Write a protein that binds this ligand. Sequence first.
Ligand SMILES: *[C@@H]1O[C@H](CO)[C@@H](O[C@@H]2O[C@H](CO)[C@@H](O)[C@H](O)[C@H]2NC(C)=O)[C@H](O)[C@H]1NC(C)=O
Ligand SMILES: *[C@@H]1O[C@H](CO)[C@@H](O[C@@H]2O[C@H](CO)[C@@H](O)[C@H](O)[C@H]2NC(C)=O)[C@H](O)[C@H]1NC(C)=O
Ligand SMILES: *[C@@H]1O[C@H](CO)[C@@H](O[C@@H]2O[C@H](CO)[C@@H](O)[C@H](O)[C@H]2NC(C)=O)[C@H](O)[C@H]1NC(C)=O
Ligand SMILES: *[C@@H]1O[C@H](CO)[C@@H](O[C@@H]2O[C@H](CO)[C@@H](O)[C@H](O)[C@H]2NC(C)=O)[C@H](O)[C@H]1NC(C)=O
Ligand SMILES: *[C@@H]1O[C@H](CO)[C@@H](O[C@@H]2O[C@H](CO)[C@@H](O)[C@H](O)[C@H]2NC(C)=O)[C@H](O)[C@H]1NC(C)=O
Ligand SMILES: CCCCC/C=C\C/C=C/CCCCCCCC(=O)O
Ligand SMILES: *[C@@H]1O[C@H](CO)[C@@H](O)[C@H](O)[C@H]1NC(C)=O
Ligand SMILES: *[C@@H]1O[C@H](CO)[C@@H](O)[C@H](O)[C@H]1NC(C)=O
Ligand SMILES: *[C@@H]1O[C@H](CO)[C@@H](O)[C@H](O)[C@H]1NC(C)=O
Ligand SMILES: *[C@@H]1O[C@H](CO)[C@@H](O)[C@H](O)[C@H]1NC(C)=O
Ligand SMILES: *[C@@H]1O[C@H](CO)[C@@H](O)[C@H](O)[C@H]1NC(C)=O
Ligand SMILES: *[C@@H]1O[C@H](CO)[C@@H](O)[C@H](O)[C@H]1NC(C)=O
Ligand SMILES: *[C@@H]1O[C@H](CO)[C@@H](O)[C@H](O)[C@H]1NC(C)=O
Ligand SMILES: *[C@@H]1O[C@H](CO)[C@@H](O)[C@H](O)[C@H]1NC(C)=O
Ligand SMILES: *[C@@H]1O[C@H](CO)[C@@H](O)[C@H](O)[C@H]1NC(C)=O
Ligand SMILES: *[C@@H]1O[C@H](CO)[C@@H](O)[C@H](O)[C@H]1NC(C)=O
Ligand SMILES: *[C@@H]1O[C@H](CO)[C@@H](O)[C@H](O)[C@H]1NC(C)=O
Lengths: 441, 433, 196, 49
Amino acid sequence: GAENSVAYSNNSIAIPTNFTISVTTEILPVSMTKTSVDCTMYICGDSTECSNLLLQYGSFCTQLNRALTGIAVEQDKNTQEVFAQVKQIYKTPPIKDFGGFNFSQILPDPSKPSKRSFIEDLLFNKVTLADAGFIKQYGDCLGDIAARDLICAQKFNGLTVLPPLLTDEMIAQYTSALLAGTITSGWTFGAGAALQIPFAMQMAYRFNGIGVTQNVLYENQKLIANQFNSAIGKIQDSLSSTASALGKLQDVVNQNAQALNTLVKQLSSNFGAISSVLNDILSRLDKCEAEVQIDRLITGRLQSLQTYVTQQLIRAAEIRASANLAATKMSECVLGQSKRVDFCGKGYHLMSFPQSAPHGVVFLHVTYVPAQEKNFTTAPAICHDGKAHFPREGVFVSNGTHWFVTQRNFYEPQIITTDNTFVSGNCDVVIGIVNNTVYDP
Amino acid sequence: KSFTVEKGIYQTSNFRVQPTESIVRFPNITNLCPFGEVFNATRFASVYAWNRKRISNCVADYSVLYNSASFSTFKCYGVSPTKLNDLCFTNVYADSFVIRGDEVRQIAPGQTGKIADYNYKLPCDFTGCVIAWNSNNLDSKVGGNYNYLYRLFRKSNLKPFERDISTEIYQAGSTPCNGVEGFNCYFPLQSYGFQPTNGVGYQPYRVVVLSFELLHAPATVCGPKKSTNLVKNKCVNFNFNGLTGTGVLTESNKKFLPFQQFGRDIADTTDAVRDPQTLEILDITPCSFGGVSVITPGTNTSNQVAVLYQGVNCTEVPVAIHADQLTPTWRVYSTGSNVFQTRAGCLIGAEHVNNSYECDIPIGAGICASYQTSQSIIAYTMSLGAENSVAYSNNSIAIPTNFTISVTTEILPVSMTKTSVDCTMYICGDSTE
Amino acid sequence: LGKLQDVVNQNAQALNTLVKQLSSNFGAISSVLNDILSRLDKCEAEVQIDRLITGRLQSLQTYVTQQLIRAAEIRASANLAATKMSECVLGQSKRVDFCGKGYHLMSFPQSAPHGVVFLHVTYVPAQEKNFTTAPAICHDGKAHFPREGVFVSNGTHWFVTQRNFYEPQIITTDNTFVSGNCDVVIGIVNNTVYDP
Amino acid sequence: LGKLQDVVNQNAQALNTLVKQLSSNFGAISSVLNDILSRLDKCEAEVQI
Ligand SMILES: *[C@@H]1O[C@H](CO)[C@@H](O[C@@H]2O[C@H](CO)[C@@H](O)[C@H](O)[C@H]2NC(C)=O)[C@H](O)[C@H]1NC(C)=O
Ligand SMILES: *[C@@H]1O[C@H](CO)[C@@H](O[C@@H]2O[C@H](CO)[C@@H](O)[C@H](O)[C@H]2NC(C)=O)[C@H](O)[C@H]1NC(C)=O
Ligand SMILES: *[C@@H]1O[C@H](CO)[C@@H](O[C@@H]2O[C@H](CO)[C@@H](O)[C@H](O)[C@H]2NC(C)=O)[C@H](O)[C@H]1NC(C)=O
Ligand SMILES: *[C@@H]1O[C@H](CO)[C@@H](O[C@@H]2O[C@H](CO)[C@@H](O)[C@H](O)[C@H]2NC(C)=O)[C@H](O)[C@H]1NC(C)=O
Ligand SMILES: *[C@@H]1O[C@H](CO)[C@@H](O[C@@H]2O[C@H](CO)[C@@H](O)[C@H](O)[C@H]2NC(C)=O)[C@H](O)[C@H]1NC(C)=O
Ligand SMILES: CCCCC/C=C\C/C=C/CCCCCCCC(=O)O
Ligand SMILES: *[C@@H]1O[C@H](CO)[C@@H](O)[C@H](O)[C@H]1NC(C)=O
Ligand SMILES: *[C@@H]1O[C@H](CO)[C@@H](O)[C@H](O)[C@H]1NC(C)=O
Ligand SMILES: *[C@@H]1O[C@H](CO)[C@@H](O)[C@H](O)[C@H]1NC(C)=O
Ligand SMILES: *[C@@H]1O[C@H](CO)[C@@H](O)[C@H](O)[C@H]1NC(C)=O
Ligand SMILES: *[C@@H]1O[C@H](CO)[C@@H](O)[C@H](O)[C@H]1NC(C)=O
Ligand SMILES: *[C@@H]1O[C@H](CO)[C@@H](O)[C@H](O)[C@H]1NC(C)=O
Ligand SMILES: *[C@@H]1O[C@H](CO)[C@@H](O)[C@H](O)[C@H]1NC(C)=O
Ligand SMILES: *[C@@H]1O[C@H](CO)[C@@H](O)[C@H](O)[C@H]1NC(C)=O
Ligand SMILES: *[C@@H]1O[C@H](CO)[C@@H](O)[C@H](O)[C@H]1NC(C)=O
Ligand SMILES: *[C@@H]1O[C@H](CO)[C@@H](O)[C@H](O)[C@H]1NC(C)=O
Ligand SMILES: *[C@@H]1O[C@H](CO)[C@@H](O)[C@H](O)[C@H]1NC(C)=O
């Protein structure tokens, strides 16, 4: 990266005088495809003799089905714990009098039949084969036999994709509830019932939270609002242009589809048998050698299924980790203001907004970034009349002529007074103290 | 694999359907095969000049051979002999010759000796079968037949199914003898002496090797079975050109090349067949369509259930499930009054309810089911929760005046059982071997 | 205590599945080593027993793999429990909904078979009242903002109140602070500020 | 720095176990492909391999 050398000195401080309000998009997978498998059909193409031979294994694919059902239940659990943080389905007021902040892009659009917002619509467009499962209805596999779609081969070999419990509309409704609570009630709708608060005052709370006084909001409200709106516009273009915006989700989709395709391809292996087709074996050999060849094939295909289930358990563990992270982010950044650094964006965290996405969630972290800075001459304390003065909040600063106190993250100089500072002992122990006079009102 | 099922929705294996009928469809050919020419021949060829005969447009009855001919050895590789009636053979060649009795063992894959290296070699990956019978009363005369010759010397062993009828003098020694006989170079072909009185191992044996390959090409030599009709749109035990399987056969649209009869998908199972009689194309599908999930309150509560079929259209459920092949206890669940078409699929056995409750048994796609009391199973779109609309205004604030001190229990697992395994005892029950 | 009982059940079920999987032939003539070793001589006993050994070793490998998955999950839960004990028992956590629904006061641990139980004691504001608010107060041309709390009105007079409890107190110099003139802030109202 | 050295050891041990597991017969006549391919003709070489 760019080599840099900060101009550190023992009495020089860089204080900001201006800021920016950034909006950072960041995307977490939450769930994956609730795959299910019929062991009998996959291993044996509904032939009686192979089924009879598979009968004496029995416990193996009982275990496999148990594992896959656990995975599916875990996926539903993941989605619920991420999105169903609350249960009171709040709705936005008809009036969007939010102090100049424009939420139309993220709030629901009632014109569309589905209540996805604009950004959620873009996100659902960016991921290609999200569903590719339960949507595929029979008859298409018998009507469009010419195309030879992968899903049809998966269905004919017992590999099905179960539908998620929460539909996209229901998840979007949860998201709308979270948004409405965030932008009307502040953080209080997580800690018990939802209160109400004017949005500008909620913003003032957040600014007071990140250690800058509330007044600079009121003094720069319109500007801040404009900045926020512009940031949203930048998101509305940034994820609209490129195609790899939602890579992390599309990769998950691809892994699941690829795994199923590898399984139906692995059906083509001999596994040491005379042929990979049960029908050839059962039409070319009498009972006993058919038993032994079919046993070889059964063991091989059961091994392939066990491999698939093991990889699915690995991937489900990873998705559960990501879903736990998403739940923590929704709890700590949507439902409240997080003091943890770089947990919810690059900069001091103001708020976050959730947006649904296919098999995942998207957080728009709105954050405060100090932008323009000025050098100043500082000193850790002030000696007035033999006693030392230290600031309660802020640091001592000088423009070259006079000294003031300033809050850490914004240049708001104000004259030295008794109430700005406090006194602790004589001024002959502290290093770097300077002389000045302290106004007493 | 237990009686007491608990409350929930379970994915269950497709045992409901059972086949009921068999279909045999063999080509309309009736010419009995030339058994007379390759078995009842006046004279066979010498082993070094073994005679190859194409065979096509046959019906391999081979019960006619039971009447007269008795075969000392009849070994079949790649096919179990009991199945030879249930098959159609594509590229059938008969390789006929005569040897002595002791060398009949050399007509087999992976053998070595005079016959297996210098005269007649079979490949390792040999599909086909070998017949040999003693012929002392035909191919041996007093004084000894010398019409049967074998190649005694060769510089290198033969490749499979390779003939070598050269008669150049074999230079055994290191001095070339320029095309004449004498010392240290011999005439390679030596004549069997088949007296009618010598031992069994020096008695002439006639051998025919039938070489063919199976279930990959248009088969012209068919078995002696009797064809039946074609039952489509119903899952049957089909036997097409010996390819024996079970499934539903339907019409299709594939541009098969003239030299192809079987089509295979990515899984390599056969999917497209060409009917031998009427040169059309058929597609084979399974008759367990796929997911059939069963929804139930757990036993110790009741014994009623519902059934979801994933992805089917509620109109076409009975044909995809093949309800006509099922018992009435299944046909009640195939279709009834309690039809519901979810985007997850078709649900039968529970009445749809326009209300919305926080739900017990999830089904999918926003649908849940529960066993309510009207003591049956209901299905509904699950309720997200209480709709609310906070009364936001730009100068109104809700401040609390009182509080509560709640205590919330929440439970985390920390450890699990420290299991240990002795591999030797588990795998081997303390047996030494 | 479902979450613990499920763990117990998974471990027991896994072991039961293993001893049940001992009953499989794995392509051998029988699933019993004694039958094989009493019906066959050396060489075919070797090959049948090798088939059985490979099958049972595969079953054991499957068991160990599933145990590793489950142990990873338990380690994740144990790391979460350690973090909760550190951040909520040993201290007061500001993270929202980490240690109960509401503002976190404390937590108490309790042991349990193969797990831990946290009693999170938390503060939940219960009864609320509407009020007319304003972000600031213009006294004599300058704007007044509260240090801690928000400006509130019951309809007649204005007070400052801490965020999470209605404790109104009269406007004074020490309750508020001044920043510039009162012609830039939106929503400011007029009132008088007591000076002691 | 045990926690890191253990990771290193696990990776090295895993690779060593793999190259040691190359020495198993797995029910074949021998664990060496060269022995199998020099003692048997095509078909039984196919099945052993
Ligand atoms: C702080 O930064 C903002 C820009 O991020 C400045 O606002 C812009 O100022 C220029 C000229 O004054 C205008 O042309 C722009 O229209 C303003 N941007 C917006 C979004 O309104 C602002 O002037 C800076 N404040 C200080 C004290 O320097
Ligand atoms: C919030 O931002 C949008 C711009 O993205 C403002 O303009 C709307 O843009 C959309 C799509 O371009 C149109 O469907 C709307 O008709 C536009 N609004 C109007 C009044 O025409 C939108 O106005 C902004 N919201 C507010 C309250 O100002
Ligand atoms: C700050 O002010 C005090 C007194 O005004 C200074 O203290 C004197 O410094 C001179 C420097 O030589 C000494 O000669 C005196 O003896 C000191 N008198 C006392 C009472 O301390 C002090 O030096 C000043 N410090 C700075 C950084 O300006
Ligand atoms: C096929 O014909 C070739 C050529 O005659 C044979 O290869 C030669 O065999 C002789 C005797 O072993 C050698 O002296 C030559 O060096 C070989 N020439 C080449 C180019 O290989 C070959 O042995 C014959 N194949 C069979 C199965 O008989
Ligand atoms: C708060 O008080 C000030 C002065 O008492 C008001 O300012 C005057 O408002 C009237 C309204 O028409 C104007 O005619 C005067 O020109 C204003 N004088 C000055 C010095 O500003 C102010 O309007 C009051 N604001 C509220 C919300 O009550
Ligand atoms: C001196 C005795 C032999 C010493 C060498 C021992 C073993 C290796 C040679 C093995 C071949 C044995 C003779 C087989 C002859 C061909 C038989 C046939 O194909 O018809
Ligand atoms: C502060 O001083 C250093 C060196 O004098 C200089 O490099 C730096 O640019 C100054 N900071 C700003 C914001 O100008
Ligand atoms: C520094 O601050 C004082 C305070 O009034 C001001 O008078 C002076 O002009 C300022 N000087 C510079 C260089 O900013
Ligand atoms: C700060 O650094 C300078 C030289 O780099 C030194 O002269 C000065 O004494 C230092 N300030 C203090 C309080 O020590
Ligand atoms: C065979 O021959 C006739 C004429 O090609 C054809 O119509 C018939 O369907 C075929 N099958 C049988 C059993 O005759
Ligand atoms: C073969 O020959 C014998 C007598 O020569 C005769 O009885 C028999 O029917 C013939 N069998 C065949 C298949 O031609
Ligand atoms: C099971 O049956 C017994 C006796 O009827 C009853 O006490 C118990 O509550 C039942 N438990 C469940 C889960 O149904
Ligand atoms: C099949 O499902 C579709 C819904 O997309 C429906 O329009 C159609 O009517 C159904 N087919 C029949 C025969 O009902
Ligand atoms: C349920 O809602 C549908 C659609 O409005 C309607 O057709 C049906 O009559 C309703 N049934 C009941 C019992 O309310
Ligand atoms: C506050 O005002 C709204 C509408 O005037 C009302 O619905 C709500 O009940 C009020 N809040 C309380 C605690 O009464
Ligand atoms: C509002 O607060 C003032 C402060 O004294 C009080 O006098 C008045 O009675 C209160 N009015 C209402 C409606 O609460
Ligand atoms: C608050 O909303 C009302 C109408 O909804 C509006 O008249 C009023 O001007 C708004 N308050 C401010 C400070 O803009």
